[PDB]
């Protein structure tokens, strides 16, 4: 920690060319931190899309003009061609930010539904998202055991279409690193 892991992940993604990735992170505030790093280093909202699907009421006080912080939800971005095959032209704000994002800095639960769902059509949007985009999962050790199982299911599904999985965990256990490699290998 403290060495700039997420910046190194973006560097590794950009080494192969232009970036198309889903930064799936635990917690809302860690996604906010990675979004703020992406904003102040080089990434605008035409490429980045911070997705936290709860609409929290945590606002910044003191000075709105002198903030230079509090990464928000606008996504000027670019609507992908996949929105025409989704129901009713995808959706409003949230699913447009999901599907059409080049870089999707999101909470992870908007990506683990790609592996499948009980009832409804909630699988298709993260499925089609992870089909054409890379997957970057940071500090996977903080998740639960079943959470890590479904995250490696997501890694297997992402590798099923040739995309690249970046795992960023310092305290990795050989077991975890191995089963994530075996999911990527399958």
């Amino acid at each position: 920690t403290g060495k700039g892991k997420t910046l190194a992940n973006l560097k590794l993604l950009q080494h192969f060319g232009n970036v198309r990735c889903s930064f799936g992170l635990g917690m809302v505030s860690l996604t906010k931190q990675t979004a703020k790093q992406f904003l102040d280093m080089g990434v605008d909202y035409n490429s980045a899309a911070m997705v936290t699907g709860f609409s929290k009421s945590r606002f910044n006080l003191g000075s709105e003009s002198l903030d230079q912080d509090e990464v928000s939800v606008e996504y000027w971005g670019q609507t992908s061609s996949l929105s025409k095959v989704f129901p009713n032209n995808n959706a409003g704000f949230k699913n447009k930010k999901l599907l059409s994002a080049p870089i999707l800095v999101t909470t992870t639960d908007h990506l683990v539904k790609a592996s499948g769902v009980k009832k409804g059509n909630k699988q298709m949007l993260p499925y089609v998202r992870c089909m054409h985009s890379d997957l970057v999962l940071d500090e996977i050790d903080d998740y639960g055991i079943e959470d890590m199982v479904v995250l490696a299911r997501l890694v297997y599904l992402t590798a099923c279409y040739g995309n690249k999985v970046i795992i960023s965990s310092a305290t990795i256990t050989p077991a975890i690193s191995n089963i994530f490699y075996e999911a990527y290998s399958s």
Partner: protein, 278 residues
């Protein structure tokens, strides 16, 4: 510490603790109202930032003071905090490594004697001596430690880093915490398909990997909501001990997440420490 009532027990003991030290106590668990919780976060991020000396102005560093933050595993995940020292209630070894990462995270000065004091037992030993590390840990009913003594299951003096988690040991998992951790990790995330496993094949066709392997599997979790100072369910606001509280932010809106088990009794929300059993 491990859980919320453990945190308020450590807080209520330390507040009533007579000493010459100027203890200033904070509670940092997850059961808090929208406003109060967010306020704790921003304050803690701006006082524990030790890459510069900007914090000297967010706390009273003029007077010798012990600024103590009693927290649950919400501090060891995703927090850019830098403490001078930590006292850890043992639940898992990755908790030890992460709370080591909350001490001297921003500085580079080496400690001289000892900067982490690990407790002898988790507090669930006095409540359940059969199993005590299952809360926020990989101990469970199928993987039981033979002894719960941390002299038996951990090194008495140890340089805590990622090395013990990085190495990986499957032998002697019943009397060491690290090998207990590694055992569970290879016995649940295995190269099989099972039904709740990771290579799942044949079952993707079925609804089984989405029912028996539930993402964010938590307890029932109902949400008692504070509406403008007036609580919804069986909450009953209370008064904290006002002995050593350094900072206490008030809250009026927001919601608290209470497990259905603790819904039976009053969660007794308080401005200083959120939920407990009283």
């Amino acid at each position: 510490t491990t859980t919320i009532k453990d945190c308020v027990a450590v807080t209520q003991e330390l507040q009533n603790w007579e000493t010459d030290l100027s203890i200033k106590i904070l509670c940092y668990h997850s059961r808090f109202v929208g406003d109060t919780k967010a306020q704790m976060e921003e304050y803690l991020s701006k006082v524990l930032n030790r890459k510069g000396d900007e914090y000297k102005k967010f706390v009273d560093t003029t007077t010798p003071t012990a600024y103590i933050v009693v927290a649950t595993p919400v501090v060891e995940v995703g927090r850019d905090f830098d403490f001078d020292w930590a006292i850890i209630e043992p639940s898992s070894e990755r908790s030890i490594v992460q709370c080591a990462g909350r001490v001297l995270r921003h500085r580079s000065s080496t400690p001289t004697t000892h900067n982490i004091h690990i407790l002898k037992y988790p507090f669930k030993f006095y409540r359940n001596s059969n199993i005590c590390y299952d809360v926020a840990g990989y101990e469970s009913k199928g993987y039981k430690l033979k002894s719960k003594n941390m002299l038996d299951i951990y090194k008495k003096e140890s340089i805590v880093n990622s090395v013990n988690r990085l190495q990986g040991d499957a032998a002697f998992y019943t009397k060491s915490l690290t090998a207990l951790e590694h055992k569970v990790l290879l016995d649940k995330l295995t190269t099989d398909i099972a039904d709740t496993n990771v290579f799942v094949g044949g079952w993707q066709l079925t609804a089984n990997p989405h029912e028996y392997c539930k993402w964010r599997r938590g307890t029932k979790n109902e949400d008692l909501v504070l509406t403008d100072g007036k609580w919804s369910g069986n909450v009953t606001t209370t008064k904290p001990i006002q002995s050593k509280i350094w900072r206490k932010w008030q809250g009026e809106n927001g919601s608290i997440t209470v497990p259905e088990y603790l819904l039976d009794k009053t969660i007794c929300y308080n401005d200083f420490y959120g939920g407990y059993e009283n």
